[PDB]
Structure formats: structure tokens, C-alpha cells
Amino acid sequence: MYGDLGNKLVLEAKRTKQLYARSNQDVNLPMYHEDIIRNILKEVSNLRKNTEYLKEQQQLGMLDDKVAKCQYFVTLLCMERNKRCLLAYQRLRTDILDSMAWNNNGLDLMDTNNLSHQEQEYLKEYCDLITDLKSGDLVDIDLSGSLVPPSDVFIDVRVLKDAGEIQTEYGVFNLIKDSQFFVRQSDVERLIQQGYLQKI
Amino acid sequence: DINIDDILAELDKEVSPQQDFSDLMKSWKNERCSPELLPYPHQLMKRLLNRISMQSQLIENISMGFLDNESKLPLLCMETELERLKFVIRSYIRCRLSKIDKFSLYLRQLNEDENSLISLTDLLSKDEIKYHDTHSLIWLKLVNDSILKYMPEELQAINDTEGSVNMIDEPDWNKFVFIHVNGPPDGKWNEDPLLQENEFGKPCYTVTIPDLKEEVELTIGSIYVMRYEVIRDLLRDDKVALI
Amino acid sequence: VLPVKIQPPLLRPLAYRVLSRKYGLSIKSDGLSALAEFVGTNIGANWRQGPATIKFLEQFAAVWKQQERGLFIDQSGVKEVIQEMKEREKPESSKALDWRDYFKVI
Amino acid sequence: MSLPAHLQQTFSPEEIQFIVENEPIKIFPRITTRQKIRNHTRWQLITTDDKALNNMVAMRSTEVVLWIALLLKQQSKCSIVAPQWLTTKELDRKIQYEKTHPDRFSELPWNWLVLARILFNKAKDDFHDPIHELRGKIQDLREIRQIKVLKGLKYLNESHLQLDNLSLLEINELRPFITEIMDKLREIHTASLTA
Amino acid sequence: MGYYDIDDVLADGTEFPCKFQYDIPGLGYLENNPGRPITKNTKLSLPLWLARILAIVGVPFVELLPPDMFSTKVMNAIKTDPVALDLHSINSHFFSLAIKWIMLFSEKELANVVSELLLQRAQELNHHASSLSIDLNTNIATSTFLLKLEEMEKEIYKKSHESYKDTKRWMFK
Numbered sequence A: 001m002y003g004d005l006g007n008k009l010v011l012e013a014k015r016t017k018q019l020y021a022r023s024n025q026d027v028n029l030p031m032y033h034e035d036i037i038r039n040i041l042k043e044v045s046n047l048r049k050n051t052e053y054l055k056e057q058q059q060l061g062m063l064d065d066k067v068a069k070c071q072y073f074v075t076l077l078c079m080e081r082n083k084r085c086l087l088a089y090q091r092l093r094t095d096i097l098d099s100m101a102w103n104n105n106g107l108d109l110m111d112t113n114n115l116s117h118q119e120q121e122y123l124k125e126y127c128d129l130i131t132d133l134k135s136g137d138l139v140d141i142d143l144s145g146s147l148v149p150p151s152d153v154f155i156d157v158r159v160l161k162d163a164g165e166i167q168t169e170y171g172v173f174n175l176i177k178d179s180q181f182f183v184r185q186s187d188v189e190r191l192i193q194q195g196y197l198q199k200i
Numbered sequence B: 001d002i003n004i005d006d007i008l009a010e011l012d013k014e015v016s017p018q019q020d021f022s023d024l025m026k027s028w029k030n031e032r033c034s035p036e037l038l039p040y041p042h043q044l045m046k047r048l049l050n051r052i053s054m055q056s057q058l059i060e061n062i063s064m065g066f067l068d069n070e071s072k073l074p075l076l077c078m079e080t081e082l083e084r085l086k087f088v089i090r091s092y093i094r095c096r097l098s099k100i101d102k103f104s105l106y107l108r109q110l111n112e113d114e115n116s117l118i119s120l121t122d123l124l125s126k127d128e129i130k131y132h133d134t135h136s137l138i139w140l141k142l143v144n145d146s147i148l149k150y151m152p153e154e155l156q157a158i159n160d161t162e163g164s165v166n167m168i169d170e171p172d173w174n175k176f177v178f179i180h181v182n183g184p185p186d187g188k189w190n191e192d193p194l195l196q197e198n199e200f201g202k203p204c205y206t207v208t209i210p211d212l213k214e215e216v217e218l219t220i221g222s223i224y225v226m227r228y229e230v231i232r233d234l235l236r237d238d239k240v241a242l243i
Numbered sequence C: 001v002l003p004v005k006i007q008p009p010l011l012r013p014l015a016y017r018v019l020s021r022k023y024g025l026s027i028k029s030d031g032l033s034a035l036a037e038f039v040g041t042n043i044g045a046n047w048r049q050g051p052a053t054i055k056f057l058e059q060f061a062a063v064w065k066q067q068e069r070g071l072f073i074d075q076s077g078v079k080e081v082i083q084e085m086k087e088r089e090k091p092e093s094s095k096a097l098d099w100r101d102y103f104k105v106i
Numbered sequence D: 001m002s003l004p005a006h007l008q009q010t011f012s013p014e015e016i017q018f019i020v021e022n023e024p025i026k027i028f029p030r031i032t033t034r035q036k037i038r039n040h041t042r043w044q045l046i047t048t049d050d051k052a053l054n055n056m057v058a059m060r061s062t063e064v065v066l067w068i069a070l071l072l073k074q075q076s077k078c079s080i081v082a083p084q085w086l087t088t089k090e091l092d093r094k095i096q097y098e099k100t101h102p103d104r105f106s107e108l109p110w111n112w113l114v115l116a117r118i119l120f121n122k123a124k125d126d127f128h129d130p131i132h133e134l135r136g137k138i139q140d141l142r143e144i145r146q147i148k149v150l151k152g153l154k155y156l157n158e159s160h161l162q163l164d165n166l167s168l169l170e171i172n173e174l175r176p177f178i179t180e181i182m183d184k185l186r187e188i189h190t191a192s193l194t195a
Numbered sequence E: 001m002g003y004y005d006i007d008d009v010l011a012d013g014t015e016f017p018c019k020f021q022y023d024i025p026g027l028g029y030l031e032n033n034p035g036r037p038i039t040k041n042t043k044l045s046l047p048l049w050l051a052r053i054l055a056i057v058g059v060p061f062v063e064l065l066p067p068d069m070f071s072t073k074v075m076n077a078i079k080t081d082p083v084a085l086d087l088h089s090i091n092s093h094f095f096s097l098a099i100k101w102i103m104l105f106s107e108k109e110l111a112n113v114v115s116e117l118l119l120q121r122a123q124e125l126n127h128h129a130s131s132l133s134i135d136l137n138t139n140i141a142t143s144t145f146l147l148k149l150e151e152m153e154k155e156i157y158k159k160s161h162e163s164y165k166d167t168k169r170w171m172f173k
Helices: A004-021 A034-060 A065-104 A117-136 A189-194 B005-011 B017-033 B042-066 B073-102 B104-112 B126-146 B228-236 C008-023 C029-042 C050-064 C074-089 D013-020 D066-073 D088-100 D112-122 D131-153 D168-192 E006-012 E048-054 E072-080 E094-105 E108-129 E140-146 E151-171
Strands: A154-158 A164-166 A173-175 A180-184 B176-181 B203-209 B214-219 B223-227 B240-242 D024-027 D062-065 E015-020 E044-047 E062-064
Touching: A004 A034, A004 A065, A004 E006, A034 A065, A065 A117, A065 B126, A065 E006, A065 E048, A117 B126, A117 C008, A117 C050, B017 B042, B017 B073, B017 B240, B042 B073, B073 B104, B073 B126, B073 D066, B104 B126, B176 B214, B176 B228, B176 D168, B203 B228, B223 B228, B223 D168, B228 B240, C008 C029, C008 C050, C029 C050, C029 C074, C050 C074, D013 D112, D013 D168, D013 E151, D024 D066, D062 D066, D066 D112, D088 D131, D112 D131, D112 D168, D131 D168, D131 E108, D168 E094, D168 E108, D168 E151, E006 E048, E006 E094, E015 E048, E044 E048, E048 E062, E048 E094, E072 E108, E094 E108, E094 E151, E108 E140, E108 E151
Parallel strands: none
Antiparallel strands: A154 A180, A164 A173, B176 B223, B176 B240, B203 B214, D024 D062, E015 E044, E015 E062
């Protein structure tokens, strides 16, 4: 009828949902489907023009309340459904972007071409908001820290990517590749998150 | 014979960090499993924040003094204990944020509702209020300039409830959750009302499911699966704990 | 504005607690030494450089958007950008903006 | 989002382990922290009481929080004491009680599975009983309780449910299924009762 | 039934058979006659989200006919052998549409049947979910049963099986 574009869009959205649902592959968002967005926007614009057309033709012409009410109501419901499909797709993209931002605030700030300009600006400001929340009052705790319980304090690790020498809180770590440390898990969480130390 | 426990109690009747930590974990257990956003314990979080600040300062002072016997075991104990506390509070706060954004529009309309019996400040911390406002405004900006811009005003509302399907999300009050009947928080049973002594001598509460109009008896020391709405009032009274 | 030299070992705890803990910034030995030298040059007794380090990290996160700021060019770049933002607000510099920095031929 | 999807409404087994880690248990200190009448740093914690830790005496049983005991057990500087339910006799009695009553669960402590796993992993040599037999009996109890749970599942009504004496780990592992099936059954009934 | 439920959104856009009650003018935009109106007593398939509103406002404009999925044949099939029913073939979102139809019509018997079907299939899907393959160094029944599930059953199964796998992994680590 008229919701076919929104139906395809929400089908693709659920497809992306299962895509990211599997494991924790941390894949980037699929490219913004500006094509379907523009198509459904053109459909909505044409239906809005049809509503204005029906209104003015009822004003000038002699149309009973029956047809004028019914066609206008049906078209309004059509915009309701199409807007709901667009809202669901955009909400999915926003929530997955939130996931990427929350998990990767201490990991990396990254292919942005898959996102629209509004989404890119949203991510850019949302990182700022997250940092503001971390530094506002709950600064003593790390809000972006690991959500797994700290079962053990001292662990051994192996250097994946050689980073030369990095100053830790008190001493210093010589991240020689293929070398194993046995140190506190507390001060190496960020390095493991980035992908430098591997063992547990 | 005559029992003398009365006089033994007579002669025996002449804020602790452990209690604060236990209350914090009880709140975290409730927050993880409850469908709705439970009220923020402002005083408890303030006390824990002060404790963490002073504890971290003390740990740093000990480390500086040691940086000039070699019983480092207590220092490691403070380190891992502070780590556990920080992890607990981190998980609690992030769960609360997930609940805030799940019900962002519900919170906003409750704020706008003058007949609402609560206020967001009475339910959220200052940081939570800041995050709710910022996220609401930015997501509204994105939906406006992305979708709502090309839309007529009658369907441009971001909190439309009169459409074909309600577009404001509400907490599922009838959600099914695990509960354990702790009974009254104090050790005395007869002091607390609603504890109708069931058969077999077991003290129990009695609550009604209005949908089925069915009376169910919850015995103390028993684990149940219940609709959250029925338990909600008792849960606010700490008589039961979410499992 | 008192010039002084502060050694990396003493600033290392605070520098870590700020850059790495607060926002997730990796610090190298050379970058730590250079930043200590800069802090000592632009402040004496090395106490109220916390705002300076916070400005450094926030500008680095807003513009650079990577890690391992201790590379002598991320540090220098953020320092200079702080210099021009202080200049346009009208420390290390309080002069006026020049079009020569904004005029170029390609 | 701030909370990952798999942590939305259930606890990961690591979270259950962490929660159980705060239970107090009785241990034998291999050191003696009792500062004599004739320096040292006290634990002076805030999640628990330091009084016992500052006053430990070698080979004198005290009670401390579980995770501190495990941290000490990382070295040979302590020793874990198994609770009274971790004896072969009590396990056998619970087995007989379970086999005797097919409709009700045993009165085990709520954290028995996780405690058994932790003690077997990190305190494998602090049991008067053969560990190879304790593991088998624990597995047998787990299987019997699973069998009972499956039979109790055939009576999933739409109003409520009573899982009496059930342990913590089983509840945590069964939460996402039961709490979701129960929701759908309630929703169907409510939709039917829309008059 | 939340607004942003993807499953609910997909379930809303499902065609249902329904006759007309008025000779309404000017409709049929994509119903084989854009300018030509829609006649009275005309049986057409309409999306459920729109047919829901069209079935209440009016004598209502549209009279909904019982869909094939809730015909007495499918009811008898459900009452016969709930476990061996390929409900996915009937529809990918059968339970949500059943819920919506019952809510609209207050048809208690359909709700009673679907609740029993849900319970009986929940038993089997829990049996499958808690069954974890162990490598001695994907059973046939597991896969041949998984294809007969709607997305919600496939979602409950995924969540429960993930919980079981996490429990097993932690227990034997």
C-alpha cells in the first residue's frame, strides 16, 4: 500500500539487530540508507500535498464529511505508520551508536562514512556528554570501566602490540613484544581494552 | 516449667559501614531486577562517596609513606576492596542510566505532570538529571532535524500518546520477577502488621492479584515468582528482596 | 609564571591519575618528560597545573582523537592550540591572532 | 547502550560469584596478626569489619569475608574450613531427603553450587573428605535438582509460582526463560480479560 | 507492545482479509484503482495496523474476516500436536498477531488454545536450550526443531541458551 518502504527499512533494521546481536564482533553500523529515507520522505511529502489538495478541494467543492474525513484520516494514519517505521530505524541506530560509544570511550574513537551527518554530530556530542558525566561528580569511580567483577587483582599478561615504553602510575612498563608481565589488573585495564595485553 | 528468657533479655538489654555496604548491595539487587526505576538513595551514595574519597586518600598516604615492615598484604586488601566497591557502584549507576533512557519520555512526562506524586529530583541524582536532560534534548534535536522537520505539526510531537499506538514508553508494572520474603527488616515479627500467621505456624503475608482477583500467601523464608506491581509496595518497605 | 624544572618521576602519579585514569590517555616516558618541562616552565612548584593538563587532554580528545599523546607533536600541537585559544580569548601567550596563520597558497 | 543486552535483567555467573564472595566463612589463619603487648598496618576496611583480621592468631579459627580468605589462600598464609554441609554424611542425607520427597527441594544454603566450585578450584586440599567423591555428589545433587525443576516446569501457571528452597545459581540461570514465558502467559490472559 | 519493538512494528504490517461496509469514494490509492473508489461489500487484504483502526471507527467501515492462521483447521492442528507444528511456516510473528487479535476481539477460546500451545512448546524449547553439545576432543533434532519457531521463540531460546552456556562455561573454567 504505502508502508512498503517503511516495512523494508524496519526489516533491514532487524537484520542489523541480529547482525550485531551475534557475539560481540563490534562491527561498525551498516551504511546509512539515505536512499530509503529519501524515498519515504518523498512519499510523505506527496501524501501531505494530497492532504492539502483534499482540504482545499473540499473547501471550494461540495464534499460531505464522510469522504473528506475518511481519506484524510487514512492518509494521516499512513504518515503515523511511516513515521513510526522511521523512528524505529533511527532509534535502533542511535542505541547501537550508544553501545559503540560506551564500550569504546576507553578503546577508540572511530569508518564514520556509514553514519549521516546528524548521527556523526550526535556521536561527537555524546562522547562529550559521557566525559562530562564521568568528570562531574562521580569522578572518583571510573564510569567507563569494566562491567565484569574484579575477581582477581594480580594477573599475568603478554604484549600483543609493542608500544615501546609507557609510564604507569608509579613505575613504568616496557611493552616489549612477546614479553610477559605479572602485575596488577587494576592499572592495565585500559591497555588490555585498547588491545595491547592479551592474557586474561 | 516457667521460662526465664524474659529476665535473661532484661539483663541483656543494658550507622555502620557494613550496614551501608549491605544496603547498597540490596539496592543494587533491586535495581538490576525491578522493571521500573527505583528511587535514588541520595544519603547512602553520599556516604559511600565520602568513604571512597577518604579511603583512596588514606591508601595514597600509606603508599607515599612506604615509598621512602614489608607486610603489604593489608595494602593489597584495601586495593581489592576499593576495587570491588567501585565496581558495585559503577554497575549500579550504569543500570540506573539504562533505566533512565528506557523511560526517558516517561520521566519527562512525570516531570511535566503536576498531578504526579513524585519529582525527578526525589528519584534521580543531580548527575542523573543532567544526563536525562542532555540526552532528551540531543535526541530530540536529531529526530527533529532528521525526521520531524519534514513532518506536519499534528504528528510532530515527540510524546504523542493519542495516535494509533502510544508512543511514550511506560514501565511494565506487571513484569514477573523473583522475590525472597525477608519478612520485616527488624527481627521482631509481631510488631509489623500484615503478617497474618498462616497455618503450620509459618508467618506470612497475603496479597491479591486484581486481574485474577486471587489471594496468594507469601511465607517468610520462601522464594516466589511474582508480578512486580503486586510486590512493589512491600518492596518499598524492604519486607522482600529481589533475587 | 615562575620558571622551574620538575622531574618526570614526581609528576608521574598525578599525570597518570589525570590523563590515563580520567579519560584514557597513554603516556610515554619522552612525552612525560617534555610535559614536565613545559609545566615547570609555565608554573612554579608544579601544583596548579591540573587545569593545564585537563585543557591539554580535552583539546587532544576533541581534535586529535587517538591515544599515546606523548609523541612530541600531539603534545606540541595541543600546547599551541591552547595558545591560540587563550590569545583569542583576550600562561604562555596572550597575544593577538594573525592572518598569516590563516593565509596560505596551495 | 550503557548496559549490554546480556546483562539487562539477569546476572552473569561472574556477578553471582562476586555476590557470594561477600559471605562470611570460618578459616584458620596461618599467620598471627595479634600485636603482642610487647610497625604494621591494619586492614581498616569499610565493606567489612577489620577486628578479626587485626586479631588473627595462628591456627585459631576465625570468621572473615570469603574473598579476603581467597586472597590469602592465593598464598599458603591461610586455610579454608569447609562448612558443615560440605561433608559426605550431610550430602548423603540431603540425597536421601531429595529422593524421598519428589515435590520439594532440599534445604541447602542458597550459594552451595558457587561455593563448591570456588572451594574446589582454589582450596582443593583443605577437605577431610576425598574431593573426587565430593565433586561426584555435588554433580549428583545438581542433576537431581535439575530433574525436579523440569517436572515443576510442567505446571507453569499464569498467576504466580513458588520455587521453595531453590538455590541461587539455578534461579539465575532459569530467570530469562521463566520470567519471559510467564510474561507472555500473563499478557495472553490480560488480553483475553479485556472486558 | 512498546512503540519501538521491532517485532511489534513488523507484526503491525501484516495483511488480513476484511470486507467493506460502505461504498467509500476516492480510496484504492494502491488497491488496483487509485482514482476509482472502493465499492461496498468488497473483500480486500489490509495491513493489520490500519485494519485495526478501520475496524472500530465508523457501523464500522471495515468488517474483519477470520484469517487463515486462526481458522478451525489450524486450531485443530494446534490442539492435536503442538510440538510437531511448524508455526514459523504459518507465520514469523504468529504469537504477536494472536495476542493482537484476541485483544481486539476478546476471543477467550483462542487465547486459551494459544496459551496451552505456548506452554507445551516452551517445555520442548527449554529442553533443547539446556542441552549443550560437548566436544570430546549441532544435533540433528536441535536444528530440525529450531526451524519451527517464530522470532519470539527464537529470541527466548537464544537468551535461555546463552544463559545456560555462560553458566556451563563459568562452572567448568
